[PDB]
Amino acid sequence: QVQLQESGGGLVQAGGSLRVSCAASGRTFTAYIMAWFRQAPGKEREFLAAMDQGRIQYYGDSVRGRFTISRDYAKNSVDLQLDGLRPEDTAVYYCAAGAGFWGLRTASSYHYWGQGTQVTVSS
Amino acid sequence: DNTTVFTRILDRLLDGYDNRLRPGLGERVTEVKTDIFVTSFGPVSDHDMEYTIDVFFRQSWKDERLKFKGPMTVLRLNNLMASKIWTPDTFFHNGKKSVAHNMTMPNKLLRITEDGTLLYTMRLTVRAECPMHLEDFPMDAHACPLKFGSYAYTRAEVVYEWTREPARSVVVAEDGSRLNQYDLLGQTVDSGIVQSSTGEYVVMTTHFHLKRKIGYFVIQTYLPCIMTVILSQVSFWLNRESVPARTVFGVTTVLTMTTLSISARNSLPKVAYATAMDWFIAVCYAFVFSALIEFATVNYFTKRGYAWDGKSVVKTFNSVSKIDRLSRIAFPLLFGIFNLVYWATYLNR
Amino acid sequence: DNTTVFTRILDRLLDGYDNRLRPGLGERVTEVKTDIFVTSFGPVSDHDMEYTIDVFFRQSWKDERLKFKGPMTVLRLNNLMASKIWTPDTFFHNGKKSVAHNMTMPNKLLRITEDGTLLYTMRLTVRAECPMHLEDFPMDAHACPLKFGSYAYTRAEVVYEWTREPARSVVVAEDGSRLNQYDLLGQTVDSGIVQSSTGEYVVMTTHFHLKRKIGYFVIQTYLPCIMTVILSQVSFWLNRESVPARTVFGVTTVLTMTTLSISARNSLPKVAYATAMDWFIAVCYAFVFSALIEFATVNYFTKRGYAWDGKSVKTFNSVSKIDRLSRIAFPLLFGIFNLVYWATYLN
Amino acid sequence: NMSFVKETVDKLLKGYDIRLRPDFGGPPVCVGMNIDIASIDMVSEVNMDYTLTMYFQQYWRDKRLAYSGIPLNLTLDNRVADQLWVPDTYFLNDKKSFVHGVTVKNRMIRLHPDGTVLYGLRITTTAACMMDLRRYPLDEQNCTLEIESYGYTTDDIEFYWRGGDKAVTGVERIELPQFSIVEHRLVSRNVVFATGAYPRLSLSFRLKRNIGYFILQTYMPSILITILSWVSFWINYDASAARVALGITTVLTMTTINTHLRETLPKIPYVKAIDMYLMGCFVFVFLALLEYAFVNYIFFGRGPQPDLTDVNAIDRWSRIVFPFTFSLFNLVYWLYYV
Amino acid sequence: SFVKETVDKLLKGYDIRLRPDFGGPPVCVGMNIDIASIDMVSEVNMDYTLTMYFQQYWRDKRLAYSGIPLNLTLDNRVADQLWVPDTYFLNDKKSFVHGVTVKNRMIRLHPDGTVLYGLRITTTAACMMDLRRYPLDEQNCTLEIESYGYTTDDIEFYWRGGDKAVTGVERIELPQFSIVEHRLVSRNVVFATGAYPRLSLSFRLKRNIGYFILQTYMPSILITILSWVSFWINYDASAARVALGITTVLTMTTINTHLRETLPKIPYVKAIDMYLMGCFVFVFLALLEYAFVNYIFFGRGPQPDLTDVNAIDRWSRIVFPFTFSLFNLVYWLYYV
Amino acid sequence: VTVILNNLLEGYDNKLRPDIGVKPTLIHTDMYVNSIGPVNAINMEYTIDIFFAQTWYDRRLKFNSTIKVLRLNSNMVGKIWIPDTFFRNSKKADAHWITTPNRMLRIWNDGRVLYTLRLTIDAECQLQLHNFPMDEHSCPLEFSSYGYPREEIVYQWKRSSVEVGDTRSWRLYQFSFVGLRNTTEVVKTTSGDYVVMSVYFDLSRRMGYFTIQTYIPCTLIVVLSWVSFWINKDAVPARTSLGITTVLTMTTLSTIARKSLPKVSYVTAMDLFVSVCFIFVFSALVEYGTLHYFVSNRIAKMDSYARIFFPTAFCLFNLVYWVSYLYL
Ligand SMILES: CCCCCCCC(=O)OC[C@H](COP(=O)(O)O[C@@H]1[C@H](O)[C@H](O)[C@@H](OP(=O)(O)O)[C@H](OP(=O)(O)O)[C@H]1O)OC(=O)CCCCCCC
Ligand SMILES: CCCCCCCC(=O)OC[C@H](COP(=O)(O)O[C@@H]1[C@H](O)[C@H](O)[C@@H](OP(=O)(O)O)[C@H](OP(=O)(O)O)[C@H]1O)OC(=O)CCCCCCC
Ligand SMILES: *[C@@H]1O[C@H](CO)[C@@H](O[C@@H]2O[C@H](CO)[C@@H](O)[C@H](O)[C@H]2NC(C)=O)[C@H](O)[C@H]1NC(C)=O
């Protein structure tokens, strides 16, 4: 069974960077779009970043210029360089992978999902 | 001396003009405004994982070295003038063999407005890539991309941007479809950034969403496989003394399923896994394989090698087999139960 | 700067140089010295009777208008200046749509020595025509020619010749086979003179001696034809009364040989005669078809329709005096024919 | 006589600006077209296209190219067409096209002494069709050729067919090996894109397909093989290995006809009119084999336990019904699709 | 402006027929490849199609400009007015630079004279494949980059960054193959004219096996097994035990005939021809087994194991499922 | 003698033909057929490789000197008026450019100009495929000027008009070169009257390949169905199964026999043969379906009649077939 195991960090100072990673196993995702998401408490899943096969970084409009997605096609993973963490970014970060049919921004196009990583920004 | 006025304007614009320099090379970025009119979304080749598209690829940018004052507010010029003016080097990031048409003249238009705002369209036939995930073949869907950007000019030099609310800046002509097998459900327009070895580039993106109509493979593959399993299940309804006849059912329908299982994966990329059509044939091959192993069991317990003459009642004759009286019900049932789980797993996604 | 003196040499070579005129136009002939390095002898197409070849086509001559006295003796120049200097109009006589490569630059080099000797070479991809006689298919051998000479210059103006003892001129790369069906058994070069309607032209010839590897057609054609004739002779060893069983031998094995007679001609151009493989199929079709005429004769003399029982000695049938001879004649005459076939055509 | 023509052409091209349309600020230039079709090469259903070779000519009037003293129609060399204004007319259906270039690039420039310019081209284009193969192979096909200016709108250029019904010639001399050209039409209209209103001409065709091939290829074998499935009704029911071997080998032969026809046709998502017939004749073969298994069940399964409960009655029934049901199948088929 | 005068100073009297340092040291052209995709790897034509971003760095002192701090990214048409190396590919059958919407070149001048000349090349490079272990084999496909008109006295090649020169290999997902490793070899080669520098990008294409199981192997197993039904059918059924073996030697033929349509005309026995001729023997011996039975009971009748008719069948029910299972154990351990 | 060429082109206008107000230029064409490639019956084409020569008189290229001939390269072709001769029925015509432009240009002192270039033409030949495969064809090769009418360019053949090579190295697989003609006609099109030269290549097919692939397997399987008349009555599964696989093979052989042909909509002479070869295969099983019925349920001596009648009625057909398509 495909497991999207995640890592990263739990707590960070407001004004400190973080690096959230996502390793994959059971399927070679070198042809899929591996993306990140964000679900605030009391709020739907919000798109953060995505990288295609051709190393093309699709960012969300509210998070552009801050985060930097980077994939590792050899180790079959995806990274998300958290940078400039405001206290409005305290949520659960999900790791997705899918072909993007009616997608690349829509959360219903990703068939494989991660578990989640509570990122807490304290001021 | 009628048309000497517009000749004087065009010669004045090209005196101190250098077509090797970006407009504002050490000043600012060059906001190129794009637009695509898809005339015909041509036939998708499964064997090459490619598709063909025929677009009017529009571009628009402001060149301040082409300001003029004349009788007209826009110079609807020839395509020769476009080769003497800086035009951006937009290429397609996943094009295999794309054609810039030039029948009968090079299909380009250049329109210089009075303040320098240019318009520059081309009629292209892009044969682009489309990475396919053929796990649910043929009941699947694909998002074939069409991705373009500058080749030499980085993010800090040329920035592409869609005109007029990007979701409605890639319009498809209703006449030209050219999709016999697939079905275009709509497009999705986005924009991204690469990190090449030379720098960041601005990359436009249009994902065309397809959906394979499965009407072909029902006629050619699914119904010849269903009607072959039924022919293997005809042989349960014969007498057990017809060994040279019930063998002909159980072996020729294997030869039929062998012909179907070889010629089903034609015009497909030789993928390293089983498609959803392969999970239908290999199970339908197992109802035909087991319809002959069943007869090998009934032949093993047949004592009397002669049929019922008719003028008697049960010399001693062979009774109707208890394996046949069960397998007249179990094999049409277990095939029908599989034929519900198969078409509900895949037609719901 | 430093390269100003080399621009002064190259501009002086082209002042008054006419590339439309042969060197030594009213004095002598132009003795062009050719050389071919075959990088890869590409795949030979039977369906087109052509063959691809990838050469370093070298040719050298003396031009007394390009002499110079510079700091260095050989100007290893760019490929741009070769379009401003007379190059001989060498074309391939049996050529077809051949390709001069243009990646990433046009693959040409021009080297001017200080006495005016040029080394204009090209990387071509020649698809020459090879007329094939397929009467011994597949046990045959071909001599596929290259023939190149000038086009506008007769033997009185441009004369071609080879360098370095002509058999050592056309050399092939040892790691450049690129043959999956044939086998290059060396080449044989020769000069020549062709009487055309516009004059007498000097023609350099090069005959590549090929030979077809038999092993593909033994697997795909000869073994399914032998294992069908053996299969059709299985039916002799059965009893006389299995008429719905021995008929299935003599009808399927005719269908099998008919299938093999079709998909064996697809490996050829559609020539209008019988190859040496068709004479194997037409005789192997005769042993299969005679294995059913035998059974139709045995069934013509069978009187009782029931077989033998495992407890008796009712009148049962005999063991078919035709069939006791057909189990000796048919396996032996097919063995005699293979010694006639495989010793006539393997030489 | 000779140097006077040489000094006249040198002053027509002196100061001639090929970047400017004739009457660049004034009225639109009227371009009249004329097509002489050489041949239609191939009409491929797999690629949904047709290859068209034609002599494509254009007349327009350019007042700058108006010589006076010479009483001739100066047919110049085709290299001057790179030094003149010619319209940027394209083909919207064009996939792949090329102007022929043997022995030179086949163009012509025939200047007239009032400024009228003839610009001929020998174009071989591979224009696309959109085929409705629901009635294949008993169908009629509409395949067009959309001619349109690219850069100049209807304010700058206007198109018309010279001799509005006799502009396209050579249609009746086209010999297609499979189709048959019924008629052709000439339409002059205007299309509106996001950049302006462009003039558009359209030569269209009505390709009716001939069925002399498909009878000998698919229909007439599928008739005779279906009739040979009916031999198992005049054969005794005791012959188990004979009435089965008819119906088993006949569903093979009705399969191998279907597996050959799929190779020459594209991935069509619907039932064609030839797939309404091969699947239809497959049922008469498949029901002729279920008929024996219904005979072989009554005499042996319901033995020791339309007319039924009788073995010879079902055969005497099926000898009349299947030559009557299949004969009604052809009568419904060959009247609905003809 | 100031840049328009600066570029014209660089290209005033710039002789593109002359190598940089034409009378002195050789120029060091450093290369860099960013592979886009590998389109199709065909065994019939013995080639593969490669699409890549091919880049070259060298320095040229004639193109040095001061004052401007920027890297002058010029139009691609100035590459027809500069010196660029005449690097080619030996394996090249048919290649082309992509020309939509323009010819995809780039010229990025640096203020010390360093020149970037990038290309987007789709080349069809050749591979002579060793198909003796087909379809269980590894391959080796190279790309021989070489200068044409300049010897090693004039030009030198090197990969930039060492092993980090060729990128984008891990992004490649071939449907048939699977890339194991790639190597970067820098050397010199000697022709009859001089010693030329040569670079080579090699690959190791290991073929996936999941296609050929469902296509060739797994049918041919389950049809060899259906020739074994005849040993359970009684020997009196002559029309039944023949129709098994006759249809099964037809069915092993149709697997063989529908395989050579998509495969070159190589003479040697592959690993799939060794298997399909191997499974043809177990089918053919299962039909000779019946004619051995039918000769003993009916020919030797009236006048290992014994010549009893039931004993030969009970012997063949054990040996042929054992020998064919022994055949696969030798096969799938010699090639895998 | 560079001075001869520079004065020859100084004041020379290559846009204008010679005698543009005086005379139609007379061009003496000359053709050397190097080879004729495969006549592709599917696309109705044939490939031809020719050396194509043209001589015309250009008074502007006169020169008074000693050399009396100027044997030149293809570097002068782009500076002299060259006629715009196109092949009227060509589809993919290509000149040769390896290693140089393969063109030849020779100028004599009286103004006569020889111009020869090597060409491959995929010409059009509408194959009337009746009497297949015993047909004879005359494939044309037509050429004329493109812009210059009859009043401006007139072509003419020479006394050595079309010259033929060895004919053994040609790529004529199924055909055989039997004849050669030429003609001169003036067509009438929209842009004037053009003088159209035409070369007709008479081609006849050898019929050696279709005998091996089609005729011999179709006859030796009609004979395969004749084996059942010697197999006795009441051999019911063997008489039946011999008469269906013979039908199954006629379905296979009729399918493959139409691969080299295009999709023609009529009955060729091969299609007449195979359709009759259905009938003797069809009427061999209907014979047994008659004989099995009317015995179990004269007619009983039908096998005594069918062993004589069916080898008679098939050999009588070959007397009608092979004579009416080779003679009469
Ligand atoms: C793939 C199927 C594999 C089945 C393997 C089954 C292997 C197995 O062990 O079969 C035994 C038996 C055979 O059934 P079947 O009726 O064919 O065999 C009867 C049996 O041998 C009696 O003993 C005979 O009578 P008797 O001796 O005179 O009293 C009788 O002959 P007669 O009365 O005419 O003289 C024979 O017909 O089957 C079942 O009971 C149903 C199993 C259903 C199993 C599930 C079937 C789907
Ligand atoms: C293509 C071959 C054509 C062969 C055409 C041959 C045609 C021909 O004339 O055959 C006659 C005969 C048939 O031999 P065969 O043994 O099959 O037939 C026996 C024969 O008919 C006896 O006369 C019968 O006995 P009877 O006294 O009547 O009661 C006996 O019946 P029964 O004892 O069982 O009751 C029959 O079985 O064959 C030869 O003598 C050897 C020929 C070898 C020929 C080998 C040629 C290779
Ligand atoms: C030059 O071309 C013009 C235009 O085609 C010719 O004028 C036509 O001549 C034909 C007879 O040849 C008449 O039937 C048409 O009515 C004329 N049309 C017009 C608009 O005048 C003219 O004859 C040609 N002149 C020469 C010398 O060839």
Side-chain angles (χ1 to χ4, degrees), chain D residues 59 67 71-73 110-114 116 162, chain F residues 151-152 190:
Chain D
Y59 290 182
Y67 61 94
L72 294 174
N73 287 319
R110 184 175 292 173
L111 296 177
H112 296 284
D114 56 353
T116 305
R162 291 186 60 86
Chain F
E151 293 88 5
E152 293 179 354
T190 305

Side-chain angles (χ1 to χ4, degrees), chain D residues 146-334:
Chain D
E146 303 294 325
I147 305 168
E148 186 182 0
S149 177
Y150 190 77
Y152 296 104
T153 64
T154 188
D155 293 331
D156 293 332
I157 196 166
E158 291 179 353
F159 289 163
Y160 64 96
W161 294 100
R162 291 186 60 86
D165 292 331
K166 295 187 288 184
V168 175
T169 63
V171 179
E172 292 87 4
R173 295 178 294 172
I174 297 169
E175 183 67 28
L176 291 172
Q178 188 175 3
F179 291 94
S180 178
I181 296 170
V182 175
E183 65 182 0
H184 67 280
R185 291 179 182 176
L186 295 174
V187 177
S188 179
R189 66 186 180 93
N190 294 320
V191 296
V192 174
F193 294 103
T195 60
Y198 297 99
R200 179 175 290 175
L201 301 178
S202 67
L203 175 62
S204 66
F205 294 103
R206 186 178 296 276
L207 296 172
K208 184 177 179 181
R209 191 184 299 274
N210 293 319
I211 58 169
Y213 177 74
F214 293 95
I215 296 299
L216 295 173
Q217 185 66 40
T218 60
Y219 289 103
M220 193 66 204
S222 178
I223 294 169
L224 296 175
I225 296 161
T226 304
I227 295 170
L228 288 173
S229 67
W230 297 345
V231 182
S232 65
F233 303 106
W234 287 269
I235 294 173
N236 194 4
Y237 64 96
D238 292 330
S240 296
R243 295 180 69 185
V244 167
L246 279 164
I248 287 297
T249 314
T250 314
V251 301
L252 287 175
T253 317
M254 291 302 295
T255 302
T256 60
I257 292 170
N258 197 3
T259 61
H260 179 76
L261 187 63
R262 64 182 293 166
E263 294 179 353
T264 63
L265 292 170
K267 304 294 178 68
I268 293 168
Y270 50 85
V271 184
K272 295 180 288 293
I274 197 164
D275 289 331
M276 285 296 291
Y277 188 78
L278 294 177
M279 293 172 68
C281 295
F282 182 76
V283 175
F284 291 100
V285 172
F286 182 75
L287 291 176
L289 187 58
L290 291 179
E291 195 275 337
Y292 177 69
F294 186 73
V295 170
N296 204 4
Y297 179 74
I298 292 175
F299 189 74
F300 290 100
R302 293 182 185 271
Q305 184 178 2
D307 194 1
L308 297 176
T309 66
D310 193 1
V311 177
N312 201 5
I314 301 170
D315 288 331
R316 291 180 182 176
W317 180 68
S318 295
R319 290 170 187 173
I320 301 170
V321 172
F322 285 170
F324 182 74
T325 305
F326 181 74
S327 179
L328 290 176
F329 179 73
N330 288 319
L331 187 63
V332 173
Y333 181 76
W334 292 102

Side-chain angles (χ1 to χ4, degrees), chain E residues 212-228:
Chain E
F212 295 95
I213 295 169
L214 295 172
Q215 186 68 39
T216 59
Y217 289 102
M218 199 67 203
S220 178
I221 296 171
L222 295 174
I223 298 160
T224 306
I225 297 169
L226 289 174
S227 67
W228 297 344

Side-chain angles (χ1 to χ4, degrees), chain C residues 201-269:
Chain C
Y201 295 96
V202 176
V203 172
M204 296 294 106
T205 62
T206 298
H207 294 283
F208 293 99
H209 295 286
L210 294 173
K211 185 176 180 180
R212 182 177 289 109
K213 293 181 183 292
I214 194 172
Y216 177 73
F217 297 98
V218 176
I219 299 167
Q220 300 297 323
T221 302
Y222 285 105
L223 285 176
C225 288
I226 291 169
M227 295 299 289
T228 303
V229 175
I230 296 171
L231 182 67
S232 66
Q233 292 175 357
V234 175
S235 68
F236 297 111
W237 294 96
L238 309 185
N239 53 2
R240 301 180 70 183
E241 296 89 3
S242 66
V243 177
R246 293 180 67 188
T247 304
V248 180
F249 284 100
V251 174
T252 296
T253 57
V254 175
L255 174 62
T256 302
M257 290 300 293
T258 303
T259 302
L260 294 173
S261 178
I262 295 165
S263 66
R265 300 292 295 166
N266 291 321
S267 64
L268 283 170

Side-chain angles (χ1 to χ4, degrees), chain C residues 11 76 104 111 121 180 215 263, chain E residues 17 87 148 154 196 260 267:
Chain C
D11 290 332
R76 292 186 296 273
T104 65
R111 295 180 183 177
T121 78
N180 54 4
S263 66
Chain E
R17 295 175 293 174
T87 66
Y148 190 77
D154 290 332
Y196 296 100
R260 61 179 176 178

